[PDB]
Amino acid sequence: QSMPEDLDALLDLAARHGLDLDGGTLRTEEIGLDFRVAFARAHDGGDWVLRLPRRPDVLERAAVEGRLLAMLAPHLDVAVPDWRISTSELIAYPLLPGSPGLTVAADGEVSWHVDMASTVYARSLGSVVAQLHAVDAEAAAATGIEVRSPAQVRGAWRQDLARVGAEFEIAPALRERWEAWLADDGCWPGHSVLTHGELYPAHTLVEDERITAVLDWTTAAVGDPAKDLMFHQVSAPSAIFEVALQAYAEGGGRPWPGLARHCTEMFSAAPLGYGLYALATGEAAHREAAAAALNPPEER
Ligand SMILES: CC[C@H]1OC(=O)[C@H](C)[C@@H](O[C@H]2C[C@@](C)(OC)[C@@H](O)[C@H](C)O2)[C@H](C)[C@@H](O[C@@H]2O[C@H](C)C[C@H](N(C)C)[C@H]2O)[C@](C)(O)C[C@@H](C)CN(C)[C@H](C)[C@@H](O)[C@]1(C)O
Ligand SMILES: CC[C@H]1OC(=O)[C@H](C)[C@@H](O[C@H]2C[C@@](C)(OC)[C@@H](O)[C@H](C)O2)[C@H](C)[C@@H](O[C@@H]2O[C@H](C)C[C@H](N(C)C)[C@H]2O)[C@](C)(O)C[C@@H](C)CN(C)[C@H](C)[C@@H](O)[C@]1(C)O
Ligand SMILES: [Cl-]
Ligand SMILES: [Cl-]
Ligand SMILES: [Cl-]
Ligand SMILES: [Cl-]
């Protein structure tokens, strides 16, 4: 990244919260829509991450995330951020060790740092997800995250299809696929767990193809266990997903026979998530992108 021109203001901000940084090491990532992010070494040599809230309206999501991280860290063997400073103007935590399993460059180039056909990653993922899914769901709920029963998990997808269908044209081929998914009792979970919600390699750190930390916990919710296995299911060979499922069950996870089927159908319903986002933002650019995903053009 880059050396910021407001170095002195950033050092003052950390200093007034008790964090003394070596300004020679300070770099910033400016691309986030909700936070400005800085990395620096402290005077005692430790590496730090700084998150600067851009607007007061991001503080609610940060407060929930902070409560989740505090209660979750004792229950996972892998690392999560340890917020030693959490205020309106600064969130700061030690840099977690390891390298991201997937990085995206400034021009949009995606680079993978672990292969989805790896048995090592498959077993590491299944182990971490079983530990996460074992976390006490009532203590999870007290943090403020959303909570959905198995009944509410299925009903939310049914409602979501209806709401998106009322505001967007949906190609019949996609609508019929998703209706058949929602009608297949074999796909759907019979129990709810604490989930991450976006567990793909960009939100992990890896060492020797094993997960050593999991990041970006804003999507966490009690609900469908498959959400945390679906990205592996759609990207890994089927025998490698089965290695992940075996490690998941070995850790106390309780998969069901149609779980892999469910994962692929669910991933295909991503255009409904785009539609929901557009309706939430109201921004014309998001509505246009969701509309193109919900009603793709014909082949030529
Ligand atoms: C290459 C030269 C630079 O040195 C560095 O950059 C290294 C990271 C490291 O310096 C190198 C190089 C060397 C040869 O010392 C110069 C070596 O003996 C020390 C141990 O690490 C220094 C000692 C860091 O401090 C050490 O950061 C480590 C990550 C952890 C370590 N400790 C806590 C375990 C800690 O002491 C420190 C945090 O910068 C100390 C800080 C108080 C003073 N710095 C601002 C000075 C001025 C540095 O700019 C430097 C000396 O000019
Ligand atoms: C698993 C790998 C893929 O990762 C995914 O599919 C995510 C789960 C997906 O997200 C999925 C799942 C879901 C539920 O988003 C959470 C759905 O709404 C969207 C449409 O697709 C991402 C996060 C979407 O980015 C999200 O777009 C949403 C509309 C809003 C959301 N944020 C702003 C709130 C934003 O992060 C996005 C539109 O794909 C980002 C886009 C710019 C870049 N993609 C094209 C990359 C290359 C992806 O294909 C991927 C990295 O290869
Ligand atoms: Cl951000
Ligand atoms: Cl939230
Ligand atoms: Cl191993
Ligand atoms: Cl869910």
Author numbering: -1 to 298
Could you give the paper's own sentences about this structure?
The asymmetric unit of the MphH azithromycin crystal contains two copies of the complex (“complex A” and “complex B”), each showing subtle but important conformational differences. In both complexes, the azithromycin molecule is bound in a deep, electronegative cleft with one face formed by the end of C-terminal domain (i.e., helices α10 and α11), with the other face formed by the apposition of the β hairpin, the highly conserved region of the C-terminal domain containing the catalytic residues, and the nucleotide-positioning loop (NPL; residues 29–33) of the N-terminal domain. However, it was evident that the “complex B” encloses the bound macrolide more intimately and more appropriately for catalysis and this complex dominates our analysis. The position of azithromycin in the macrolide-binding pockets of MphA, MphB, and MphH are similar in that the 2’ rings are oriented appropriately for catalysis, and the macrolactone ring interacts with the β-hairpin regions. However, the azithromycin molecule bound to MphH is positioned ~3 Å closer to the nucleotide binding region as compared to its position in either the MphA or MphB active sites. Consequently, the C3 cladinose ring of azithromycin occupies deeper regions of the binding clefts of MphA or MphB. According to the MphH•azithromycin structure, one of these sites, MphHL31 (MphIM40) interacts with azithromycin; MphHL31 faces toward the desosamine and C6–C7 of the macrolactone ring. MphHA200 (MphIP211) is on the short helix α8 that approaches MphHY198, which forms a key hydrophobic packing interaction with the macrolactone ring close to the methyl on C13 and the ethyl group on C14. MphHW155 (MphIT166) is in α6 that lines the macrolide-binding pocket and lies within 6 Å of the cladinose. In the MphH•azithromycin co-structure, the equivalent MphH positions Leu31 and Ala200 do not interact with the C3 cladinose.
